[PDB]
Symmetry: C3
């Protein structure tokens, strides 16, 4: 059993993460996460908040996970890459998820709140069984 | 066991992917795949087709896999990167494998059909035992 | 059981890699590795020595591993990425570990010996139990192909 737990920690994030349990019977490897706020990314590095806390769980024990770009993140009009290639998230991390995005182009680029630039992948690439979206006013699973 | 299945879907790819069963006795993690056509990559983003449908299986069940650059993809002359860092291929995908390649340089660069710019890695990084190259003109479930 | 074995190749690297056994009680996924020598990264591609030989074992058998950038690597003032996204190190490789690093800026950037720009992650993302730092002079069969 492999589960993700996602809690919105801002009001804008709540609009995109209503409390619910999401099944994954397409058996996709990655869990899409929203920008949750409109962004204008400057040329060079941008530190982008994802407005969520995340835990991943495998065989009933907390595990790590990985942040990977979606194939739609980079388009002809916005040359965006993840600076660290993929984001490596240790099981012990209990802060807010963040992204280091490099705008490789010469002009700023617009991102809309509803877009999913990245996807989360469990340690070991295990297919998620459930994705639990938690209430903002809830003690994040310890 | 962990096995890949590669089927060429163009005549170009067929020249590079004759039907065969390949063993991986070096026990390398990645499966090198050809460009299968001579390309010129423009500065910035390029869409590059790999001319193949691919399936991966672990313990008898279809699974996903990943597309990673090979170390030789990026040289001083050809400053090339995969736009998405690594390509995440879901078990359900049955389309042609595609690449988004950024030419970070200032001028177009030539890719030769025989070059393998990327390699495929099974979900969970399992070492492949067999790489099965299937015939083009055959519908496989 | 997942264990890393790291042997420094040079005397600069030995200063950062005295022999020891490191326990991973935080259960972090990656193993930080030092630059071990100051370096200037020119604009564009750079091939960088890591000054170490590395082996990974899972359940008593030699396995592969992966090189990933740390969040430390790229800052607003030094736009640095791993050319290959992540480095894929096969069990049959037995040389010195290398990095392909792209300086995306138009000026040389300086890296210091002390910094850890990348981390090693076992095949399958297994959490390391021990990181064994080996003596420099000796010749270990565990690094065999
Ligand atoms: O893309 C990333 C990468 C890391 N982290 C968090 C999770 C890690 O456990 C922690 C420390 O990462 P490093 O600075 O050591 O890379 O930062 C993110 O939020 N996003
Ligand atoms: O580099 C890539 C990444 C993805 N895909 C295919 C397989 C995926 O299942 C599908 C969607 O990928 P994402 O948008 O989730 O990254 O596109 C590729 O062909 N090449
Ligand atoms: O970042 C890297 C990537 C690879 N290698 C070594 C280990 C691999 O087994 C070998 C061949 O790599 P490829 O050419 O297959 O990418 O080079 C490195 O030292 N650093």
């Amino acid at each position: 059993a492999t589960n993700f737990f996602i809690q919105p920690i801002t009001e804008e994030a709540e609009a995109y993460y209503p409390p619910s349990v999401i099944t994954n019977k397409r058996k996709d490897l990655g869990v899409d996460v929203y920008c949750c706020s409109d962004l204008v990314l400057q040329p060079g590095l941008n530190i982008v908040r994802l407005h969520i806390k995340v835990a991943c769980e495998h065989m009933g024990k907390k595990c790590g996970f990985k942040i990977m770009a979606r194939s739609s993140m980079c388009t002809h009009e916005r040359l965006l890459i993840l600076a660290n290639g993929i984001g490596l998230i240790d099981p012990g991390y209990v802060g807010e998820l963040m992204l280091k995005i490099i705008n490789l182009g010469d002009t700023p680029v617009q991102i809309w709140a509803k877009e999913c630039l990245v996807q989360l992948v469990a340690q070991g690439d295990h297919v998620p069984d459930h994705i639990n979206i938690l209430k903002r006013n809830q003690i994040f699973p310890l």
